[PDB]
Design a binder for this molecule. Structure first.
Ligand SMILES: CCCCCCCCCCCC(=O)CC=O
Lengths: 373, 371
């Protein structure tokens, strides 16, 4: 099995209260004379249950946005800076030399060819023969997805150590994509009311997603750092719900990027969540009521409610999902790593207690990881 | 260890002779009255030593490019179609059901969130719990890179079978990106003389890169298909040359392909440390290798590998023949070459082969094979 040894996070300098971000979007609507009810901005910025968010990229780009390449360059540079900080903090706290890392796995939606993990090799003295696992196309689920893929690798390499990091810059959407699309949709709205749901989805995207980075150090069973107090990855499983590609994803469009998040995600989630988790738990002779801890990615407050209702959970079991959403918002693939970092600073989990990491993302795909302390 | 069982390829319907592609680019320069030597286009389209290329995206609309939104959707759809065809041929020729594949690995620069491998489970009846390995950020190295990562997974799963596919749509750059960049670059050439080298690199990009897909079926040692005589993946290794990020890659701006002239010289810093170290740790020398399978980044790349290892002029002929047949199809190229080896050539028993590819980073990948 694989041992999760330590975690770290990194955030940009500028933390904005959710009230400030809502007012920023309201002002953009108002200065632009867009015929749309401003109360819907407040409604969805309130209903997402987020108190504030880190933005790596400027907020003033709302009114006058820079060029595509400039924003792309800034997102790439900020992603590298956060990833380097998270990895350096992780290595320092574990007293692990970079040359003793065998695999560096990455998940990020920031366009990077070569990948972020390759570029970091020029900032941190990894050995030039470092193995890399640059993953993409997984979106919000990438944090849990990466843990599973690294655990599968360390199954065959019990002596090795691996680092996984997840970094996302959701503020790139505020650099011109959200502005151009909301303007076009609202101005074309009078001629066809079918665009109303499209405007709402873009407002929800502006309300929900934030910037951040998390990292995790994972080692094989025979590594010196594999100690009995640590969570062990004992199994993992993926699930993809058929014919749900259009429900969630990130599309490249004329206006830049467009985040896709349809309201039918919550009901498609039910089609995959219980078959995924029930099968994983049963195949390990575990019942869900005996799980000591849940670590569920907060795609939204509705997603948390759906997971709670589907498994009949007491409403403080997923409190970490709600607290994380309030503190940092939805930071996409990095969120579950941030949450895992919070757990590892809680008191020592009772021995032999079982935990579950659950994430959902484009696909529509779900990832489940069974942990044991 | 890990066995390579079979391979397949998939290409779009339109095969364009290189002279036709060169003529199309000249027509763009001529119509737009771009002040630049038209014979620079002819020499670079000729000197890449490519006879023709497959373009999945249209060439008719070169002078009137469609929107970038519909180009991405077309590239996404063409990528899905080529991958589905290659995987289906692979499954049919091996008589393997989709539900019996444990892992589907993908490498592609085509923007896809969710990834291509996820979207393919709605076209091919894979199990809903299929494990996926969507990789990106590796460019032309992807095919060799994917083989190594699947091999490492199958080291922990000796009973399982995995599919890797690589697909790239290089013709996406002909849907507006090369047109916009070359126009602006040529206009500023009188004002900025140093922009000549930038025009050359875009012309080389237009001459070099093509579309295609390749797929490979790999199994662990305990799988029923793991029979003697098939190539074994006995080891693999990666190498990234320090401080060479700007030499190769793909930038968002549409796109711009980055391929600096210093690429071939920078390869010398990584090739021999990578390959000789890998072979020494497996108790063989490069002279023991019976077959080289080297990604043809270009005629200069092939020559550099030849000189670094003191190879005969025909040892890397497969790289040159592939370049002539289909051009540089990026991550898919080495899979196409491996397909030629497994399907058309005799590999002596217990002989050694080496897959070598290089891509953005600058990175190189080596995979040691044994029959
Ligand atoms: C350079 C960064 C480009 C912008 C990244 C977008 C970050 C927001 C997360 C939602 C995107 C998505 O749909 C996939 C997740 O499920």
């Amino acid at each position: 099995m694989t041992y999760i040894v330590s975690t770290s996070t990194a955030f940009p300098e500028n933390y904005y209260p959710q009230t400030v971000l809502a007012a920023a979007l309201r002002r953009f609507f108002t200065v632009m004379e867009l015929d749309f009810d401003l109360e819907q901005i407040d409604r969805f910025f309130t209903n997402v249950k987020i108190d504030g968010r880190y933005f790596a990229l400027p907020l003033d780009s709302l009114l006058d946005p820079p060029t595509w390449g400039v924003s792309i360059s800034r997102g790439l540079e900020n992603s590298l800076n956060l990833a380097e900080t998270a990895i350096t903090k992780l290595l320092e706290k574990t007293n692990v030399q970079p040359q003793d890392i065998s695999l560096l796995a990455s998940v990020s939606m920031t366009p990077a060819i070569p990948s972020l993990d390759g570029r970091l090799m020029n900032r941190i003295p990894f050995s030039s023969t470092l193995k890399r696992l640059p993953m993409n196309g997984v979106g919000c689920m990438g944090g849990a997805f990466g843990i599973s893929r690294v655990a599968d690798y360390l199954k065959a390499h019990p002596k090795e150590a691996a680092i996984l990091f997840a970094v996302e810059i959701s503020s790139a959407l505020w650099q011109g994509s959200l502005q151009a699309n909301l303007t076009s949709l609202i101005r074309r709205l009078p001629e066809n009311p079918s665009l109303y749901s499209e405007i709402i989805m873009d407002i929800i995207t502006a309300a929900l997603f934030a910037d951040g980075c998390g990292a995790v150090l994972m080692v094989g069973k025979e590594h010196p750092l594999a100690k009995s107090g640590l969570p062990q990855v004992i199994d993992n499983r993926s699930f993809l719900v058929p014919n749900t590609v259009e429900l969630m994803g990130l599309d490249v469009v004329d206006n830049g990027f467009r985040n896709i998040l349809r309201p039918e995600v919550s009901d498609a989630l039910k089609q995959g969540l219980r078959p995924l988790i029930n099968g994983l738990l049963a195949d390990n002779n575990i019942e869900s009521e005996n799980l000591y801890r849940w670590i569920v990615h907060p795609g939204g407050p509705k997603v948390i409610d759906t997971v709670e209702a589907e498994f009949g959970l007491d409403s403080q079991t997923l409190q970490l999902s709600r607290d994380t959403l309030a503190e940092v918002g939805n930071i996409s693939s990095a969120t579950v790593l941030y949450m895992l970092d919070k757990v590892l600073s809680e008191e020592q989990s009772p021995p032999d207690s079982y935990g579950l990491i659950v994430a959902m993302g484009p696909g529509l795909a779900q990832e489940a990881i069974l942990l044991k302390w």
